[PDB]
Symmetry: C2
Subunit: 229 residues, 2 copies
């Protein structure tokens, strides 16, 4: 089911949804995968997360041209770290409208990232303010609270079984929560639980640094996070 | 101390013709007391409040002093993050009929932090400035989100037409040895957030903060210098 295309891997998850995967060598870790999503919505394609690099991100656009052949209407990026935002220039070079949590955009310069063009804001219950998410189609954006980072956001894919936890969620086989360097250890557990509650019927949980898992990934992550506080 | 006024457990100091600092104290028997400061602003025929006191009773004491001393209606309050010193008195504000505003994030965190949420949520652009439709009829209050620092949700307030800017718990005074309550702090971004506050209110010469008396702009650069060491 995996398709190799250059140094990237693509996996179809549903009739209109694919997972993109890109790799970066990290000392002591070796080659580290990061996953995002590609969604076909009518005559448009919507992207969740860049690849680690601009060149890899341009390859996502090339793959889309070959396999889907619809224009990319927008991309949303799920926090200000390299695996999610490292390829912003490739999107901007291509004239693609980009969106991130306002806070991600504010942190981007400190994090060595290029800010997205547009900022999302959120209600007190975590749901995106819809005026700030123009023509997002099936992408349903939820801010679960601080966890992996202060700015981390999540995305449900309406009309499918899929929700995307980004780097907040790890799979049920994980022994750790990954990079906690920028994490909120007090609030991480509640944020993970809030993600689950926000998308209560998603059965396929996609995440940045594990292959897709069932809903146990959410609970297992929350329980690991309980031990941080 | 001369010129300061007392009402119950609260102390008030006039900082400018239309601006007072409110000070309340959390007593922890056996140790002493922790002061927290907020602001009261007279804006023509109404009053605006920045931050509650630690408790509902203390906050009601603020409101009664306002009635006694200023005798204008309190239109709204802005609270600057979801911790007890800033939001502990929300129920008293609501019982008094005062409309309450906080960062959306403060409102989201409030249940976990044991606080009552504000009635309305403020949101912010990527440059930190409040999205104006979320802060209707705020008069001279200019609300700025400097980034994560003391907490993820901390906001700051400048008072237009005055030399005053309020850093809340983000800013410490310029003789401080440390940054104080770092339990919920963002150690990586704190220094940048402090600096961003300074740049947002570049002409403010009186810096008001939660846990020190008013200082000059030196408080900002000292805070940032201390914060640089957390990284
Ligand atoms: Zn990350
Ligand atoms: Zn990641
Ligand atoms: Zn960082
Ligand atoms: Zn605080
Ligand atoms: Zn405080
Ligand atoms: Zn806390």
């Amino acid at each position: 089911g995996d398709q190799r295309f250059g140094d990237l891997v693509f996996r179809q998850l549903a009739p209109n949804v694919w997972q993109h995967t890109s790799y970066l060598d990290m000392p002591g870790f070796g080659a580290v995968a990061s996953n995002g999503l590609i969604v076909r919505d009518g005559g448009r394609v919507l992207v969740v997360d860049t690849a680690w690099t601009d060149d890899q991100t341009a390859q996502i656009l090339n793959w889309i041209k070959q396999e889907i052949n619809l224009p990319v209407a927008l991309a949303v990026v799920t926090h200000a770290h390299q695996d999610k935002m490292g390829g912003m220039d490739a999107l901007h070079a291509a004239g693609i409208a980009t969106y991130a949590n306002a806070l991600s955009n504010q942190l981007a310069p400190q994090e060595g990232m290029v800010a997205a063009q547009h900022s999302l804001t959120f209600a007190a219950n975590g749901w995106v303010e819809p005026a700030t998410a123009p023509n997002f189609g099936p992408l349903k954006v939820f801010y679960p609270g601080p966890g992996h980072t202060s700015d981390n956001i999540t995305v449900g894919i309406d009309g499918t079984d899929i929700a995307f936890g980004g780097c907040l969620i790890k799979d049920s086989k994980a022994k750790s929560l990954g990079n906690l360097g920028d994490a909120d250890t007090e609030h991480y557990a509640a944020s993970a639980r809030a993600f689950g509650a926000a998308f209560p019927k998603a059965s396929m949980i996609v995440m940045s640094h594990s292959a897709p898992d069932s809903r146990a990934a959410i609970t297992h992550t929350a329980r690991m996070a309980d031990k941080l506080r």
